[PDB]
Nucleic acid binder design. Structure first.
Ligand code: NA
Ligand code: NA
Length: 327
DNA sequence: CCGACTCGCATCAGC
DNA sequence: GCTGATGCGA
DNA sequence: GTCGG
């Protein structure tokens, strides 16, 4: 649907969602508004009334009333008010800094720290993650065109194989589904030496090499199985420097690898659909495994999986190409 | 009427 | 010092 | 806030 159809409504609901998450700290109300925003964004008609929208799954009485007010007035009194609220708008804004959630935003604003400038003046009140998020505030809100993602993939796959040619690496997310742009890079990594029933340095090796060739620039968090950090393509010639990008790297045991690939390939809606159809067939699918359900409901031991296709097969489904996986 | 809506890592709260 | 809870982002 | 047991 064209944005101009119900964009005013969906924008309204999305903004309400953010204030619930960031100010009221009501995560379930936050997801409630988003679900309403999503289902309305997919609605192929311009909504004439709240009663019309209430027919959609996820839109209840309260949102129906809000839509009635928005349609009749072009705004929402409650939204208009919280917009001009200095405390609430500042709390909501500060959460745009990676590492600053609803709680940290509240505490900062409570003691008079409201803007990026205020943040820049009080660095010693920020933890390591928050300083990085502050440093790359602008870059982290930029999207990544696919050509840059492709070049990022080149470096990752090359350096990973250089460390150990027996590594297996897959760039997932929307990029694997063939998207024109990405919000970040999500790399899934495994090695034949690493299983569920199984060195605790396989991830470090790869991270270290990507640091050595100056691809990885910063580290947000790093353990034995999960890395979260910052990277940057090398600058061409005398061209303008590339934005710094968010990159995650996960080490997954061989026997759980392809369940992970599927899950982190998405999309969420596709994964939702697929999980629903998994159930009726008598299988349970999560990030790690696909399991067989006993006659009451007792899940037996995880089924052997050696590819994405294996999973699709178990539930008597035919392989859907990553490009065909938005639903 | 009222409960539902996973986990790795960094850091806090408390012993 | 360690264990468990919480915040955060995914 | 919405859904549903
Ligand atoms: Na509804
Ligand atoms: Na944040």
């Amino acid at each position: 649907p064209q944005e101009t159809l119900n964009g005013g409504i969906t924008d309204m609901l999305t903004e309400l969602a953010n204030f619930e998450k960031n100010v009221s700290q009501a995560i379930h109300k936050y997801n409630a508004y988003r679900k309403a925003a999503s289902v309305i964004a997919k609605y192929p008609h311009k909504i004439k009334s709240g009663a019309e929208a209430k027919k959609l799954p996820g839109v209840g009485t309260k949102i129906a009333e809000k839509i009635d007010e928005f349609l009749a007035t072009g705004k929402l009194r409650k939204l208009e008010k919280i917009r001009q609220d200095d405390t609430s708008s500042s709390i909501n804004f500060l959460t745009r800094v990676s590492g600053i959630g609803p709680s940290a935003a509240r505490k900062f604003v409570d003691e008079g720290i409201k803007t990026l400038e205020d943040l820049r003046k009080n660095e010693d009140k920020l933890n390591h993650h928050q300083r990085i998020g502050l440093k790359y505030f602008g870059d982290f809100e930029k999207r990544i065109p696919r050509e840059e993602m492709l070049q990022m993939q080149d470096i990752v796959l090359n350096e990973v194989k250089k460390v150990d040619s027996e590594y297996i690496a897959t760039v997932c997310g929307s990029f694997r589904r063939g998207a024109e742009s990405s919000g970040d890079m999500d790399v899934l990594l495994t090695h034949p030496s690493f299983t569920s029933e199984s060195q605790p340095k396989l991830l470090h090796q790869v991270v270290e090499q990507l640091q050595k060739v100056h691809f990885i620039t910063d580290t947000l968090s790093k353990g034995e199985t999960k890395f979260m950090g910052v990277c940057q393509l090398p600058s061409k010639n005398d061209e303008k420097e590339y934005p710094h990008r968010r990159i995650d790297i996960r080490l997954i045991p061989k026997d759980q690898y392809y369940c992970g690939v599927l899950y982190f390939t998405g999309s969420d809606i596709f994964n939702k659909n697929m999980r629903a159809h998994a159930l009726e067939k008598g299988f349970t699918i999560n990030e790690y495994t696909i399991r067989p359900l006993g006659v009451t409901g007792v899940a037996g031991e995880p089924l052997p999986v050696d590819s994405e296709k294996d999973i699709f097969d178990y539930i008597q489904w035919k392989y859907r190409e990553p490009k065909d996986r938005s639903e």
